[PDB]
Amino acid sequence: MLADKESLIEALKLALSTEYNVKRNFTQSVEIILTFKGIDMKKGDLKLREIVPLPKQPSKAKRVLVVPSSEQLEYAKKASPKVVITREELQKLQGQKRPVKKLARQNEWFLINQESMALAGRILGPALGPRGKFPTPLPNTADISEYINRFKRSVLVKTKDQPQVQVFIGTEDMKPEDLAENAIAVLNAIENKAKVETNLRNIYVKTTMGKAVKVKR
Template identity: 45%
Template sequence: MPAYTREALAEAIGKAIELGKGRRFKQSVEMIIVLRDVDVKGQAGKIREFVTLPKGRGKERSVCVVADGDLAAKAREAGAKLVLTSQDLQGINKKQAKKIAGQCDWILVRTDLMAVTGRVLGPALGPRGKAPVPLPASADIQGLIKRYANTVVARVKDQPQIMVAIGTEDMKPEDLADNALAVLSAIESKLPSGMGNIGKIVFKTTMGMPVEV
């Protein structure tokens, strides 16, 4: 099993960025962790980890909030993409719910409004893999919005692999390597044999060629 050092990861990321240059938009840098000896239909395959990238996501992620009163006001002040109150939820139809689900990368919901949020927005959020995140009334909303703006979901779907964006091509390879290590750390703790269940790691830009570490 190879040693996934920061230097080795940064080198592979740098090559992937170089191979992917020339697009007219800012590409994401994607990390693909190929698993081995993991049954994706079993308990070991049920991996869904929220990972806050230490060096940031590289581009804005939309954090929306469902709350009332003081918490809603603080969310607006903190720069939430969208703030919905319990009254707002009452008038949302299926078409509007789909639009909201498309706008929001994360939806933080005050705990007492989780049930109504699930009923109104759940059918639109579910297929997109965007489960609402419970938000205590006493939460540091500014800190949480900043945190989730730089948080990604590392999960196994129907194949024995995890594919997650760790930043953008204009970031330093070393910073992207730090983000990759954060993802690896989170995933390793959930695997039966830790790093022994990782077959290989590949990096690529959105439209670029894959580079194996």
């Protein structure tokens, strides 16, 4: 509960201007970055690794890689992420060397079927130290498809070693004012689940590639 609903108003919503940002070719996204005091990470309280997808449906946000089977292949590509294989017909990512680092670096969220923790796990998942990626389960249904859509447009906050509450949320061109409850269903949402209440540092916010702004208590 960093703050009530009215927090990501003048905090994360600014890109259209002049001296501020830059007038590139296409509209960019929005950033949320803070600055912490020190470091501590193995017994008490950090590492924000939550399951926080997103209600509304934006556009092509993050990417996903799937390792289904032979009975769940085409029904696991309804989002055009990057590339999806099968089970038996999939043994190319365990023979070469360097080419292996092309299916793990540019894929944020994962939607790996519950039947693949090795064929793609220690090969293109938890091994990614910097990116901090891993495999996550799926709901309990005999069908696996829509979960793919309700997972790419999502936003994850990888744990690592950077002093800043990086909280991706979407973009900025349609109706950024859509933080009526979506933004409230991300950070503010996590309060009836995690174990927190007080003491993180100051809160900062800013524009993309121009300057930096501030937030409030």
